[PDB]
Design a protein around this ligand. Structure first.
Ligand SMILES: O=C(NO)c1ccc(CN(CCO)C(=O)Cc2ccccc2)cc1
Ligand SMILES: [K+]
Ligand SMILES: [K+]
Ligand SMILES: [K+]
Ligand SMILES: [Zn+2]
Length: 355
């Protein structure tokens, strides 16, 4: 009954040489790590070492061309890093970016391995750059390789191809890359909650709407919960978990749970504009711990208020360690009820628990 933690300060070396105030800051991960020490959570965790992902491991989800392009940035002069970054939607690149992205993925693989070999029950991965916008063939939205997607495939690569993996993505943005990588797959259930605003919110695609339910044998295995109409918080996230995330997850019966845990829906985040509290994230984590015999891996995605993400992810680790959930029914925003019911309508053909 042990919680693993992976963190490596070498992931701070990825930086924006043109705008040192860009919100995807190196100190995102060092501030989260420091808060774990201050709250005396670090000493209660089993430290899992970081490692580099291998290029063969990246090929679990990414094309050889994409891997080769990002790898080539290691040796580029600034002008060519600028040019290469500009080929993507919202990407900046330094000579250290490729290595940091490898460490983020390799750290999560070692964490999934620690869970699946029984060395730990659950784990937290304090990693950057993020992953969930990265596609098979392209970088996007501060993400180079899709760490969470890769970790699901790595888990399957050391157990069985059909291992049931649930990915819960509570980053405020839609994980477009994760959805696409698994869109035809019934072994990986992708559930995303995200601000949508009818396509006005990044990444600005109708791929994120509730009617995108998966393709082929994956039909029913992609669950988009899109928010419209401004600020959402704990009441709306708790209701989405009550009506949708947890009933569907229980029916799926995952053997491993991965959380794409962005904290940019948090109170105070300048990019997300939402109001989920640290206690809220604690309750979300505690609910997910009831799944998969507690085999849960929390993977940092976005989140840009340093104080907010440090307190919120620490509360998640406190729940993984078995601490009692903090005290937290406020009526939902009217448009949140509309969103939840749209998703229920979309997925009742596939999940009996919704009927
Ligand atoms: O991964 C993410 N969050 O977890 C993420 C990815 C891409 C963006 C892009 N984005 C929104 C649309 O341009 C922005 O960067 C907005 C911005 C932020 C600071 C100053 C000026 C503008 C914003 C956030
Ligand atoms: K999301
Ligand atoms: K779809
Ligand atoms: K899927
Ligand atoms: Zn985000």
């Amino acid at each position: 009954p042990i919680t693993g933690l992976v963190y490596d300060q070498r992931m701070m070396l990825h930086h924006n040489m043109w705008d040192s105030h860009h919100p995807e800051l190196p100190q995102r991960i060092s501030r989260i790590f420091s808060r774990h020490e201050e709250l005396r959570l670090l000493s209660r965790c089993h430290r899992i070492p970081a490692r580099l992902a291998t290029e063969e491991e990246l090929a679990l989800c990414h094309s050889s061309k994409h891997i080769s392009i990002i790898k080539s940035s290691e040796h580029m002069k600034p002008r060519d890093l600028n040019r290469l970054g500009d080929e993507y939607n919202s990407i900046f690149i330094s000579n250290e970016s490729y290595t940091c992205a490898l460490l983020a993925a390799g750290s999560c693989f070692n964490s999934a391995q620690a869970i699946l070999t029984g060395q730990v029950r659950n784990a937290v991965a304090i990693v950057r750059p993020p992953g969930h916008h990265a596609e098979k063939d392209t970088a996007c939205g501060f993400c180079f390789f899709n760490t969470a997607a890769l970790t699901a495939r790595y888990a399957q690569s050391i157990t069985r191809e059909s291992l049931r993996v649930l990915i819960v993505d509570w980053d405020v943005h839609h994980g477009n890359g994760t959805q696409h990588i698994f869109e035809e797959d019934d072994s990986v259930l992708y559930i995303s909650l995200h601000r949508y605003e009818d396509g006005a919110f990044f990444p600005n695609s109708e791929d994120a709407n509730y009617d995108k339910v998966g393709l082929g044998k994956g039909r029913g295995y992609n669950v988009n919960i899109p928010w419209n109409g401004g600020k959402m918080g704990d009441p709306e996230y708790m209701a989405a978990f009550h009506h949708l995330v947890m009933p569907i997850a229980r029916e799926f019966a995952p053997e491993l749970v991965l959380v794409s845990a962005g904290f940019d829906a948090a109170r105070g985040d300048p990019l997300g504009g939402f109001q989920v509290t640290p206690e809220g994230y604690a309750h979300l984590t505690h609910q997910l711990m009831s799944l998969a015999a507690g085999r849960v891996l929390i993977i940092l995605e976005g989140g840009y208020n340093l104080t907010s993400i440090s307190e919120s992810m620490s509360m998640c680790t406190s729940m993984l360690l078995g601490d009692s959930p903090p005290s937290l029914l406020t009526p939902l925003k009217t448009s949140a009820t509309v969103s939840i019911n749209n998703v229920l309508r979309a997925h009742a053909p596939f999940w009996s628990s919704l009927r």
